[PDB]
Amino acid sequence: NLRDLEPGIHTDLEGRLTYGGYLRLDQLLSAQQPLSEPAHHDEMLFIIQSQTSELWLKLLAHELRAAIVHLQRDEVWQCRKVLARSKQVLRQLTEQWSVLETLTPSEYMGFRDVLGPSSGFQSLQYRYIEFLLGNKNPQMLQVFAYDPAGQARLREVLEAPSLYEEFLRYLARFGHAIPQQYQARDWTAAHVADDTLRPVFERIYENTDRYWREYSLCEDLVDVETQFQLWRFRHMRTVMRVIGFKRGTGGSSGVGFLQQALALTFFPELFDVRTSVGVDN
Amino acid sequence: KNLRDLEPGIHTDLEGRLTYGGYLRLDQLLSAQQPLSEPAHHDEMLFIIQSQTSELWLKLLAHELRAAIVHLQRDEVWQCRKVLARSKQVLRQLTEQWSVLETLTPSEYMGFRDVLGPSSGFQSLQYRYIEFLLGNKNPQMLQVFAYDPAGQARLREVLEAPSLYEEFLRYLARFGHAIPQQYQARDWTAAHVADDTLRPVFERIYENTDRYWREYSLCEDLVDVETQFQLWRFRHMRTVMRVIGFKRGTGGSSGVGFLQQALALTFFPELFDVRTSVGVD
Amino acid sequence: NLRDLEPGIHTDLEGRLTYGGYLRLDQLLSAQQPLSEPAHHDEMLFIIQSQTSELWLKLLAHELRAAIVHLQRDEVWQCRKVLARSKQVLRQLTEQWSVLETLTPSEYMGFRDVLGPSSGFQSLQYRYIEFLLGNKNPQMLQVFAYDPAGQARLREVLEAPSLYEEFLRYLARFGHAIPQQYQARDWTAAHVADDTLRPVFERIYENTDRYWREYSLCEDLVDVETQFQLWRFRHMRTVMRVIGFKRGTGGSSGVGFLQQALALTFFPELFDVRTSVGVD
Amino acid sequence: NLRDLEPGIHTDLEGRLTYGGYLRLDQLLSAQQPLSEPAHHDEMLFIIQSQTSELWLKLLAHELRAAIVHLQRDEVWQCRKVLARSKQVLRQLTEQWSVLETLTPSEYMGFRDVLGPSSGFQSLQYRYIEFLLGNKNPQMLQVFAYDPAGQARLREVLEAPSLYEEFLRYLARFGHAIPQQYQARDWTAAHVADDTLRPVFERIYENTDRYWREYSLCEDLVDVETQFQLWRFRHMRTVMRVIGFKRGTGGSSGVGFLQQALALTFFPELFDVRTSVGV
Ligand code: HEM
Ligand code: HEM
Ligand code: HEM
Ligand code: HEM
Ligand SMILES: N[C@@H](Cc1c[nH]c2ccccc12)C(=O)O
Ligand SMILES: N[C@@H](Cc1c[nH]c2ccccc12)C(=O)O
Ligand SMILES: N[C@@H](Cc1c[nH]c2ccccc12)C(=O)O
Ligand SMILES: N[C@@H](Cc1c[nH]c2ccccc12)C(=O)O
């Protein structure tokens, strides 16, 4: 009922790279600082739930920036591999709601007051990803005005073409009928749905043998949006079961404010084309 | 607009108050990723994040299992089962996240595996703590932590205490089951040996579920925990097979074969063994 | 790279009960009849996606009926074990959307034509489940006029207390302040949120040590509702990526009509009590 | 707390194609015929668990046959799209074990005896998939003697090149150093690992810019094999918690005989090349 230690296994790493040194585990595993007094059992779940999410969001931003570089270089297969990993990261972010759903309102009311006004609405990394996918709201910079350095990193992504705008620029380089404004415009203004892209996407979806690279990237972007909307929905269903329709710590109306983001679309013309697409030829 | 306006009442004057980033210590958490490849390797951020998210979930899993043991010691069955239900979800997220790392190819990994030196998850103190708590106590593993005295002392404290499984047997003894007296006090550093005298104890529980509903539900909770842990081991081992094949491990082991030896172990043997003789309820 | 057969393995199955015989697989695996001419590759996925869902809905109704019978008999642990299986069945119904999301609009437009007016709106088993959980709608009976035996089955569940009403009757039996109307009423009417139940759920969630059975079942129902809403949401997102805002085959506006079901609640007082619960 | 019907909704479906009609739900939903007397609550789960699996295996066979046709035609992107769906189908087959794990041994012992010798060892569609992916075993044909039509469909896939063999023939068409034997061989023989393929896969994995199609397909097949092994493992863990180390209804030793299949490989040279690939 025991596995013997194999010969050859290293035990003295004191002058070599260590597992705890590589992964900076003393730093990482001292970052959990529950505030309840006396200690509340459920506050450790609460901290770890958001911290695991912030680590996945860090990786998601790293991958999405690389997907943008690939698109800029017309490196389609490399972009698609990076988007495949991005999808898996968003899947873990969505799946993990099942842990926090074991937190009841009885448990949460034991420590919610220690949070003060702290909220996920104040997540810089979340807002960075929202902006990079295209949901640019300059009103969010004033939310971070109390933190100038974070505000600057959000302004940077605000001023750059989104992942979706980089996709349109890739379609323009391959002779699609992309309007000239996608070559240069005020990137800080959120993309507005453009009916002139309808015939561009109809031609891709209806001639998939010719436009297989474009078609596969369209579907990768619908997959990314769909998974992000599921993250939003599972978060909002968690809020409903934990605080119901109470106002949020961050000062919003709570569920209704979250429902307003579920009504937004990152890649509107990819959804809109469904109403007019015919059979593949 | 397909922009969400900021609601009135949202907190933005946050320079002197607790914020999300403050509460969750995100300056500390998100400075803990220190890739070593020169020049930078794209895939090293995934590699670090994959292990760090796992270590955060293992930290929560130890926190929950300690509480499940306290509840069992106090005969608090419904509370114990609620903590076990969360423990299962945590083990499920640890298992599901293998899907992210399976996007790492051997081509990618060979660009930075040499930076890791002898570092390995085999050297994870929190993983070893969980293995010991569930009852896979191998005193040979203390020498892996010989150069971390505080860590070694933490692993000795869980070595010297009854496992979660031994606490379940002690709970069964308090409710009049035919538990041998050795489970009241024995050398707990010695890993549990499968005990044929427990066979009739488990047969009686599984065949009289209306009388022994509390016991039956806890048996099934433990079988769930074991099965999810074995799934974690299997998915890790399948990931090792697709990334390094049958290469020896950084930690100095044979790799896949050494991992297969742990898959062969059972935490709760009498609960599996009873299946060969149980009849109808 | 070959596993040898062990000697004791039964290889002469002529006249014996076989896997295929027990599971009626001749019957099951002859029930897929694509109508596209010539055959469209993607139509097999389409049929299999809904048929697997309907087998899961068949099991979900079987379990939820058993959960009601346990509640009626105050058999709480049995009820919880049946609700645990029910949650896992709803999890499979929700997860499997990932398969259908590999169907693109230009694939579907190859065969949508063959479906005529056919729609999951006309799923008797889905509606049966919706009714049993408590979203009763007598307007649906007319949809099943074409199938009088099916229609009667839907009317039977319409006329019996829901899962939620059987929960309230269970609370009444253990001295909770459940209004007398839950003892007997016209069950064909969809439950409407009842403010007078707030103090009942406040007491349960604020004294979990005393009311652990009630607390556990409350959380089980919130879990069932949450997973049911995630099914609706994943179905709706699949509709958006396959037909967008096109009208549905069944004659509805499509996404907007589906979004109206997302605003329905099975267990309204369990969600409402979150605004007033105040430390246990 | 009620949604009104919109006026455009079709409510008069007498004589029209309905959901139930299109999906043959009369035929599908009469296919559950439990044998316990009196009826055992858990037998419905038992039948539905295998019947949902058999519907997914029917789609999986349908998709993989299409993946082979695309490979035969050098249609790499279409192949990859069908393998992506195949992966999702294998994920549902693996995830659904979580339902059957709510079956305890004292429930199953209430009706196991009604099954007689019936076993998933006798799943034609499972064996068809196993053979198509490359784990050929002529000893299985005798199991299906009772079903002459089924046996012949299983002998056909036995005698056809595997998905893996079709991949190697694809690599041979694009100038990779694939031995001549993969042009015509006795296909009823299971593929043994071939050390002459190591340099072929080293070149693909070490030059991914040049061999991006091949590399992408290599990873698709490693994905399919990994997900298939996870189905085997989850089934084997379910057997352990339901019957433990009892002999199987099908007459095998049970868990140990299942564990032997976990050591089988569909695409051995794809795993073997991990020990020699460089940066
Ligand atoms: C008990 C669990 C939770 C509750 C009750 C909750 C509640 C809320 C509420 C009420 C809001 C709106 C802003 C406000 O007024 O505070 C919000 C926003 C948000 N929450 Fe949570 N949340 C929960 C868990 C989480 C977790 C675990 C994360 C993980 C990072 C998260 C991330 C966010 C994000 C990013 C936003 C901004 C969404 C947007 O602007 O559209 N929340 N949450
Ligand atoms: C590229 C991915 C991975 C490879 C190739 C790999 C390889 C290995 C190898 C070869 C071993 C045996 C010890 C050794 O010789 O080093 C091992 C053990 C281990 N690995 Fe990993 N691993 C991977 C990812 C992970 C991740 C992400 C974690 C998460 C913390 C992890 C946790 C562990 C643990 C806890 C053990 C000890 C298992 C036991 O003692 O039974 N590994 N791994
Ligand atoms: C290509 C995939 C699908 C599309 C485009 C689609 C579209 C729709 C639409 C438009 C409706 C509204 C009724 C109507 O006008 O027809 C609907 C309702 C429904 N669909 Fe689907 N559907 C899809 C797949 C599925 C699948 C696989 C199921 C599996 C059972 C399903 C089950 C239902 C159910 C139960 C309803 C009624 C929901 C309610 O009344 O609130 N659908 N679907
Ligand atoms: C209560 C649950 C289950 C038990 C106890 C069980 C047990 C067994 C056993 C003992 C065998 C070995 C052959 C024999 O001696 O009968 C086997 C093989 C098999 N079972 Fe199951 N099984 C279960 C559920 C399932 C389900 C739900 C499926 C769904 C398709 C399935 C598919 C198979 C297949 C395909 C094999 C052949 C595997 C191979 O040849 O390597 N089983 N099962
Ligand atoms: N988007 C799905 C299906 C898919 C795979 N390859 C594609 C190529 C084109 C269109 C869709 C796809 C996926 O990535 O799994
Ligand atoms: N073990 C499964 C099924 C289950 C639920 N309640 C139970 C009570 C007794 C035995 C098994 C169970 C679970 O925890 O979901
Ligand atoms: N509802 C969750 C958490 C839970 C488990 N047991 C409980 C008892 C009481 C309240 C909640 C729970 C579940 O079923 O896993
Ligand atoms: N095999 C993984 C990762 C992947 C995506 N695209 C690739 C291209 C080449 C190599 C691997 C990949 C997948 O299909 O998601």
Ligand SMILES: Nc1ccccc1C(=O)C[C@H](N)C(=O)O
């Ligand atoms: N997930 C968090 C992480 C850190 C700090 C707070 C939260 C919250 O969930 C608070 C939530 N906005 C609330 O209204 O209760």
Ligand SMILES: Nc1ccccc1C(=O)C[C@H](N)C(=O)O
């Ligand atoms: N997950 C890790 C985290 C930290 C340091 C190393 C690893 C490894 O996976 C190394 C592995 N044992 C190897 O043999 O390649």
Ligand SMILES: Nc1ccccc1C(=O)C[C@H](N)C(=O)O
């Ligand atoms: N899932 C089905 C099963 C059977 C028959 C139709 C469907 C549909 O999805 C049709 C859909 N209502 C449509 O608007 O295209």
Ligand SMILES: Nc1ccccc1C(=O)C[C@H](N)C(=O)O
């Ligand atoms: N899943 C099945 C479907 C149909 C008929 C039998 C089974 C079994 O699981 C029997 C199993 N081989 C046993 O040993 O109990």
Ligand SMILES: [C-]#N
């Ligand atoms: C969310 N806070």
Ligand SMILES: [C-]#N
């Ligand atoms: C849905 N039809």
Ligand SMILES: [C-]#N
């Ligand atoms: C397998 N029966």
